[PDB]
Design a protein around this ligand. Structure first.
Ligand code: VO4
Ligand code: VO4
Length: 297
């Protein structure tokens, strides 16, 4: 089991070595479009790029590049789009991607300002009466409502294709207490938030893939997706023992580089999946225990 392995890695304190082995075996595919000169100002970080084979293409003829990867989990039957925190010049591209991919939810794992630096553009409206128009992609974005909890906020947004006047409801799930290169405060807090996203419909197959991002879109974003996919695999079989976390993470890293950025994020992933297994294997009451322990009030 993952719990035995977990205890076999703590004992020997070999989380650094396990995680480094993940880094050494991880896929290496080209990111030639990302590195084209004309795309320099569409990338937030030099060293975080989408692979060409899995990148999201915008449906525009000018320049279809966005720093975003489709993570398609075949066995689990769930897809995610992982992207960087939009730049001041890519907020129109970001919402264009949400529209064209038919996403219902956006999961944001970072704060706009972290450790005194701007990590992400303010790409959604903070006030109902102050809507946003992205002139380049011809899209309108209105804040419809907000539900502020102690460590996360859920927003209902209305996204409108101004060309066709069609409108969609987008749910924005904003985790505000997860430090960059850090871990959530508890398994319970993380799982309470993940199950909030799940319960919204945003991850369901009748919608486009959920969009998940932090500043770079690999560390916190990878931790979130890895936990969700592992729990889903366990769910399909009701067989916690058939789930190999390291193998799942390596499969995900075929679609975007760098997923999970520290050995303690890897270790936290194990914690989250082990705890979440209690719900999957039949203990429904544990979901209310997470909500209490997370102190969202
Ligand atoms: O470019 V792919 O055939 O790996 O979706
Ligand atoms: O914004 V991250 O360093 O959690 O990919």
């Amino acid at each position: 089991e993952m719990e035995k392995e977990f205890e076999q890695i703590d004992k020997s304190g070999s989380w650094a070595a396990i995680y480094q082995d993940i880094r050494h075996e991880a896929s290496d595919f080209p990111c030639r479009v990302a590195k084209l000169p004309k795309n320099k100002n569409r990338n937030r970080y030099r060293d975080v790029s989408p692979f060409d084979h899995s990148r999201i293409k915008l449906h525009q003829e000018d320049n279809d590049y966005i720093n975003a990867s489709l993570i398609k989990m075949e066995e689990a039957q769930r897809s995610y789009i992982l992207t960087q925190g939009p730049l001041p010049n890519t907020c129109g591209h970001f919402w264009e991607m949400v529209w064209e991919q038919k996403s219902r939810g956006v999961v944001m794992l970072n704060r706009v300002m972290e450790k005194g630096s701007l990590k992400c553009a303010q790409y959604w409206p903070q006030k109902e009466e102050k809507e946003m128009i992205f002139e380049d992609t011809n899209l309108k974005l209105t804040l419809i409502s907000e539900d502020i909890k102690s460590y996360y906020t859920v927003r209902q947004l209305e996204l409108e294709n101004l060309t066709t006047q069609e409108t969609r409801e987008i749910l924005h799930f904003h985790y505000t207490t997860w430090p960059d290169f850090g871990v959530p405060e508890s398994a319970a807090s993380f799982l309470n938030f993940l199950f909030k996203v799940r319960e919204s419909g945003s991850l369901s197959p009748e919608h486009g893939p959920v969009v998940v991002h932090c500043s770079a879109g690999i560390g916190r974003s990878g931790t979130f997706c890895l936990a969700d996919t592992c729990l889903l695999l366990m769910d399909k079989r009701k067989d916690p023992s058939s789930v190999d976390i390291k193998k799942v993470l390596l499969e995900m890293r075929k679609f975007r580089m760098g997923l999970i950025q520290t050995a303690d994020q890897l270790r936290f992933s194990y914690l989250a999946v082990i705890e979440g297994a209690k719900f999957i294997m039949g203990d429904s009451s544990v979901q209310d225990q997470w909500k209490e322990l997370s102190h969202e009030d």
